[model samples]
Target chain A: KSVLEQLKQVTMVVADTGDFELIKKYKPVDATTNPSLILKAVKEQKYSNLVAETISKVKANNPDLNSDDLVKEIAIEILVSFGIKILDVIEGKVSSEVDARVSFNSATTIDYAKRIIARYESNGIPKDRVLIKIAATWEGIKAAKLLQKEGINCNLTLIFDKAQAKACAEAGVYLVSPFVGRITDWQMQQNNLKTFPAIADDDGVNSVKAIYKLYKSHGFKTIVMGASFRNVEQVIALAGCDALTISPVLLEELKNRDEHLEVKLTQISEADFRWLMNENAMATHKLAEGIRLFTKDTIELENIIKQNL
Target chain B: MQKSVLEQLKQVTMVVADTGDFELIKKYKPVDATTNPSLILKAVKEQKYSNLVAETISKVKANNPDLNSDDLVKEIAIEILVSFGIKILDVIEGKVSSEVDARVSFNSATTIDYAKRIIARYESNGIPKDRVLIKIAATWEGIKAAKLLQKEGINCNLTLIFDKAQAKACAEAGVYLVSPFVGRITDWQMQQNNLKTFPAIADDDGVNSVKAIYKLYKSHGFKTIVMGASFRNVEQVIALAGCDALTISPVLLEELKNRDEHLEVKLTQISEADFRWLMNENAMATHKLAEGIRLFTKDTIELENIIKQNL
Candidate 1:
């Protein structure tokens, strides 16, 4: 059996990249797009036309809107357009992000989210088919909570640790996108720490497992989807997660390999596993280090957006 | 103001410990204690909790002759909560908020059923409902459930509240208590376009959000209790001086107790009218409430998967 089929038996497969071509091949039930993902995709030759068309349309309509606002507006249109197309393939919703620049502001975040949702609605995509993405900052969670109550589904991104997860759960968000690769990347950055913890290591898998258990244990109905996978192992490790959003490269890797890997992430099995805040001071330090590193990357992404605009 | 400001400030307002660290809460001696699913799970996994879990399982077997694994699990969760409660009571004078199932937040009937179930377990252990605020998500369904639970004389702590509508709705429903997240608000403020580019008052957005909610409560004569939960730094705690209550984490609590910052009431009832007017005029808050819901729901789902792997 193919890895995708194996994963389907356990967790819902989600496409993580912005490339529509990759999304079509993987046939994930859902697709997630972010500022970084879009930026990466726009840099490639294939997606350049999509970006050019959006910019030209926005510029032609409102020459008065500054390049920055126009870029953000165009970006939104492009994102929504891509998301709508994905909706045609996926059984579930597609996520398009708001401007990361406003990822922290409640008012602006809300405005951007609504605008994105409006774009989808205007395109004949129902509100349920679109999940507006927001950063996992407190404002993001707050914004998500408010949005969910109003029937707008939100996807909280950039979550690294338990506190972020808790805050999101408490906010009653529709779904959350945690970074598996990003977490592993952070672990790799530590000078003293030499290696990323094994996929099944208590701190690594357990972290996601703890969040799953807490949400399930507390009966949180919000969907959980692991994002930003570095390798097949990380992806396989979270196989039985509520959902796992994989990058194009990783999806391809899973597709090329015809073997079905064992699913590690599950509900019943996880419940039986004894949870321990087993992260030693080293693990804690590593985790925090990971967060700071990602925050740095996020800032860098913002800078790239500013430069491009 | 220095840390001593909290004690002096509390003479005019209530201060709450906003943490899941049972031990740290004891030292701060705040009036109340609040916890969410994340915090509870964190506490459950600690190495120190190994004995606690063992003790709980043993107690379950000893108490119920026919305790199966599922029953044993529920019993253990209650036992753990009871232990946390006992630890919290050693410090706080008012109540300790033990949250209901977050997954059931969307289902009102299920949430209510779970709320009643958790409360029963608490009372059976000699902890009266009054001493416990059955915490529930501030979903419309959750709010409606809390409204019903309140009629039974069971005080409810409506948590995870974000918008003015939620605050207004909770008040209308007669929720016994509500927690407006301060740090979470500040974090949201930082996500704003201008604010992200330029950092303003460390606690400007958060304190401002709480001030608005508090004024609504006091001005409308809403008997529903208001408490500010979630703090990123000590500045947030100091800014929300005159709130009905403000919950601080163990780190922030330690900072408050150690520092001699002069905590004065920066917020007042008179300012609320203007704030309310601003909210009415600001379309962002209303729109964001809906957008925020989608964001939170998404994150909650992702987090569920993270824990599902390890559980």
Candidate 2:
């Protein structure tokens, strides 16, 4: 078996993209679609049908819906429509991010999460087949705590610190996506690295290993899904993580490499993980920068929604 | 049954419990113990220890009835500090550190006087000078004071050491021990950025500071023991497992007893013009050194009043 199949034998390999063809190509156990990915997918010629279909359907049902109001309604449909397509290709759960506009408001996040999770249920996609995704903000975490009580699980996304992972476990969060490649990218940029470090030394890969080992050692129930892979080495390094979300580019590379995969995560701790996160400029900088970038992407997607309306 | 980080740490480095609460001293059972004005003041506030405070105030009052209340306050403060150390030293095999007055941090003459007086109190109580570490600040004057005290066959622990220059000066002065504040260094560097940023334990500013001092002292064959103090967490302790010593809080010690992680010694500095320029550029070290003195001085003043009101 290739490393791709070897990875699935150990860890749950997830498709970290919205493209249906790529999802089919790699056949990930789980696939997630963020607002940015949906926007990217819809901008393509073949994926344009879902955007138009979603807008027209919303218009036909609520004829007098305001342009902005219709845009809001269409976003849910576009997200679900894309989610349905990805779910068809993958047998496992698909991710649906809570709207970023209400990300900072606990009540709004709960309401939006409930609304989104309900939509998935209404469309015949089982509640268990969708991972309610949200930011790891205090408010977002609190919202997930509430949803988790109702048997709805959440993927606390953008985890850059072990504290965030521990907090997720505290709130009974189901999973945490500790971004890997992004941390690597920031370290390279900040440290001014001219070349990639070894797989074991990759900052992003090590970050996932840190979170995984911490959670596993604590016997924490929160699942650690390594996300944001920038290269095959990063993906290979996290072979035995609870799960790994790889982009199509690296997934293709892994599929070609027929090599043995080893579980890199084990157990470890001492320094305040929070203090450690802050000490590494790459971690804190990238975490804040990621949150900022996520907001802009949501805005860009919303702008696209407005254009379609 | 795997050995805990605490057990593993003790195998390599001397573990010193840094609190004045006697119950905790009996609990973690470190070889040595440390007490500052802040710790002593906190301990004296406990109701059970109220008698220790009251008895010292009464005894000092009766013995030196003719002295001014200021001298009485100083006498009672010294009595209570030594009394606590005596009780603590009985439990631990290693020595106990009792601090000199922070108010004299900048005045070598006064610091020397306070260290001598504190030593006399411990000595008169039947405790040898060897069993007590006269904790002084690492100000240039404080280092001078320790230099004088060491010559008198007194072992001194240089406190408030934040800069490498401060530590080097202490080692050069032939001081017995130098405690480079660990958590405070990290805390200061953490503030350089927003609260969002924390230094990794291995790369921690505070732990790194102590490590540099330890390496420099060893590299130069200085007998001044590098004992990391003011730990915020166990990771800081584990990071310096192979250092000469680590003074830890009881809470962190309890945490160490809970886990058995394999800890490697993260033991991993310079000259006169380099020392000045290095300390000059490193805002965290310079600022923390001043802040440490101010903090200890603040607590010592408060402790004096605690003794004053009773008299």
Interface RMSD of 2: 15.9
Report chain B TM per candidate: 0.81, 0.94
Query: Residue by residue across B135-246, what tens digits does model 1's lDDT show?
Result: 8877566787998999888889987766666788888888888887766666656765446442445446666777788888888989887888877777777777777778
- CAPRI-style docking class of model 1 based on DockQ: incorrect
Candidate 2 lDDT over residue span B1-311, tens digit each: 65888888888889999988877888877999999989998988888899888988888889897988777787888888888898899899999999987767766888899999988888888889889999987766678788899999999998887888888888888899999898887787776565565668767888888888888888898888899998877777788888989998989999998887787866743333344344434556555665666677678788888887786
- Please state every model's RMSD to the true fold in angstroms: 13.1, 20.4
lDDT of 1 at B32: 82
Model 1's alpha-carbon lDDT is 0.69
The alpha-carbon deviation from the true structure for residue A234 of candidate 1, after best TM-score superposition, in angstroms, is 26
lDDT of 1 by residue, A276-307 (tens): 11112333233233334434444554454455
Query: What TM-score quantifies how close candidate 1 is to the native fold?
Result: 0.47
Error of 2 at A252 (Å): 0.8
Residue A143, model 2: lDDT of 90
What tens digits encode model 2's per-residue C-alpha lDDT throughout A137-231? 55678899999999888998877777767777888998999888877787787667988888767877877888888887889988899888767
Model 2 chain A: ten consecutive residues of lowest lDDT: A267-276
